[PDB]
Amino acid sequence: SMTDCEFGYIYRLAQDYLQCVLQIPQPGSGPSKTSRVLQNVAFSVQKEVEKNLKSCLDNVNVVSVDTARTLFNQVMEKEFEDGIINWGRIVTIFAFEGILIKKLLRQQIAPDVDTYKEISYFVAEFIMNNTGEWIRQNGGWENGFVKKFE
């Protein structure tokens, strides 16, 4: 279905973002235009969040991928509980993924990056489930999100 094309595309974007964060080269050309555009603006947003929440985030400790999931779902539920979805807020989901990875590789004395793969799963799930409706209806990624932040 058209649902399946959307969900693999979103998974690809979340996997791309994770590898950008961890400075890993993914194969082929490099990343798609849409992925590169997302990576640049999500990073912009992420650093803006990190400086606005310095005092705050120093108290946050993400121990494992399971505690990262608990926090991700709680934070995304509280972010969209006012029912408003716009592209900027969609970017913030990625931006927050990035923060969860940084906190998780910070504390892990043995950082196992096989299992960090699971982060991109739960991120893609949240986007596909909560905001995927909105995305198809608002131009997609290719003409919706690109035309806005390229």
């Binding site: 969040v49 929440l53 509280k78 900027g88 807020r89």
Partner: peptide
Amino acid sequence: XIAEALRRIGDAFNAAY
């Protein structure tokens, strides 16, 4: 705090772009 920041900033960047 975290929810606030993502909302504010996320909404701001939507405005800006």
